[PDB]
Q: What sequence folds into this?
């Protein structure tokens, strides 16, 4: 029997996250994701994911100073930056800088802390602007926004909630890629670089970069019905919808939809995305619902980030989940090595080249 | 039920390679791997793996000229090279250069053609030597050896046989990593970079870099018994032995053992490795046998390659298999997204920081 796609296959035991696809609920070590997205911060939730408990006032304070002290890129990395092309995709930029050369958890903390610096530096560089060094007096998210635009805004809160919602979600394709690589006992950077590659795909995190163009292709709320029907006929995948586990609304999508409704109700992109959901759900089209990529992409756009950084923004948060899983998994490691059903030829002879059918 | 490690799980149908773990046989599209390793060449077997048929005289000639025409690194890549640290691991070097920005098969052919150039250039650079540009009048393997050492030797034939033996082997960890990433419809480079990360692990291709040091740790044939017994007591993994599928001798290991016996019988490393096999197999220790990593590593050492390039040498060949699988799989794609058994806490409340247990 072939189990293509591995749907429903449990590849490990985990206490990190419970994904309730039937009721559309997501929990980080027992706490509802929306509670954290609303009441927590990047550092506090990351601490919770890595350490297994909410930090006390002093623990959080010390942890925030730790992450803030890990935001620098080595001097040599900076040298490489100024010799890179200025039109690279941000996911690839991350791969590059992660590939230049308990303790594993300390390593995870450090790599996560530098992600925003890599993105911000490349952004400034690619646009010929002076670099804005990390500020130790700013939080992880505040600082990212500042290294990007040299200013601070209330919108930062919305971005922080978004990161929290995207930090973790069981064994999705990118987390699974990190686990397969981690199962060979390879280094943490290698696991992350593979995860990045998977997250980049249009059938995974990359769908976030495809949504904006799709929404524009639709054009307006009046053209939604026609676009959807066309997609069904052509068997074209509607980006921002569908999921392997959720059999109903994606709680992260619901949360972000509310964010947009409350802060960017007049966004043309949001209006179209909202109408698309209305049509697909009200008509029960394929029994599919919006997934987080539909609204996270719209929020990132409205917050002023480049479209080719959307997947990297997802990674900036999900790196926490990826590393948490790698750490947990290897604590009792098992090489992941499946197989296939052979359907090819048998007993084929090597024919000397001069006797081969012309 | 949990299926940790995915042993025996068929994740797809494939006509590329048949792995007979029970009888210790390996076939590439129906042809025994040792037949190809003995009678074929890198380009001919790669052609066979990608196109599904042995090439005619003219097809092989044209294919060899094609690969030879794809050996150059873009001018910008060269700029980056001279700003990189000189102590990077070769697998990481490959990641870097693959991350700087039918047709998929054409892409696979081009990437495979440049692998040796990346390795040779970094080798020369790291050692402060002048680069030796790819020579279009030389074969894929001949040229690699020449860009590395600026000379041609008969030993090249042994290296070519080794590459052929390592080009492909069903759904191993690195091929699987490439497939997981490929299932999201990510780009070919991303799939390869993830595969590289997995191959690098000590429980996978990386075992090849661990063998030499292990052999030296043993010291001599007289100390083999003591070392093995010690490993059993400490539950230490004996590198170069064991396999998920082979329940007996690894045909590639057998082939390479003969190569060493015929060309480097007096190699101290070979003598130790041979004695290790004798003791483990004759005493039926854990019913394990040598895998290809035991002898491929010894051959690479005797051929004069740096130990931290051994896994990259494996990749130089296996990239053919990785890409062949990606191409085949996505022709009828299916997102790979498993799950886990949740064993963590439930119904946990978010306690305001001021009320948390100090």
A:
């Amino acid at each position: 029997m072939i189990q293509k796609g591995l749907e429903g296959v449990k590849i490990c035991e985990s206490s990190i996250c419970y994904l309730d696809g039937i009721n559309g609920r997501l929990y980080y070590r027992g706490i509802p994701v929306e509670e954290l997205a609303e009441k927590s911060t990047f550092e506090e939730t990351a601490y919770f994911l890595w350490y297994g408990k909410l930090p006390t006032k002093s623990e959080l304070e010390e942890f925030k100073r730790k992450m803030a002290d890990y935001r620098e890129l080595p001097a040599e990395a900076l040298g490489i930056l100024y010799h890179l092309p200025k039109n690279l995709h941000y996911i690839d930029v991350l791969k590059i800088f992660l590939s230049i050369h308990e303790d594993l958890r300390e390593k995870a903390i450090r790599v996560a802390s530098v992600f925003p610096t890599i993105l911000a530096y490349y952004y400034r560089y690619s646009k010929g602007k002076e670099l804005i060094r990390p500020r130790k007096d700013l939080s992880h998210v505040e600082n990212f926004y500042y290294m990007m635009f040299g200013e601070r805004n209330e919108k930062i809160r919305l971005l922080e909630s978004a990161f929290i919602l995207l930090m973790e979600q069981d064994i999705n394709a990118s987390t699974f890629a990190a686990l397969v690589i981690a199962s060979t006992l390879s280094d943490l950077y290698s696991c992350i670089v593979g995860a990045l590659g998977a997250l980049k795909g249009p059938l995974h995190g990359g769908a976030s970069e495809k949504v904006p163009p799709m929404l524009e292709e639709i054009g307006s709320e009046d053209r939604v019905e026609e676009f959807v029907q066309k997609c069904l006929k052509e068997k074209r995948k509607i980006m921002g919808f569908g999921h392997r586990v959720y059999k109903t609304y994606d709680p992260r999508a619901v949360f972000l939809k509310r964010v947009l409704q409350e802060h960017f109700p007049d966004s043309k992109l949001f209006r179209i995305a909202s109408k698309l959901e209305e049509y697909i759900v009200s008509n029960k089209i394929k029994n599919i619902y919006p997934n987080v990529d539909l609204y996270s992409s719209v929020l990132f756009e409205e917050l002023g980030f480049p479209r080719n950084m959307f997947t990297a923004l997802f990674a900036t948060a999900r790196v926490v989940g990826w590393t948490a899983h790698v750490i947990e998994y290897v604590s009792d490691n098992k090489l992941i090595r499946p197989t296939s059903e052979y359907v090819g030829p048998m007993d084929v002879e090597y024919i000397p080249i001069e006797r081969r059918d012309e």
About this structure: Chain A touches chain B through 104 residues (CB under 8 Å). DSSP finds 16 helices and five strands in chain A.
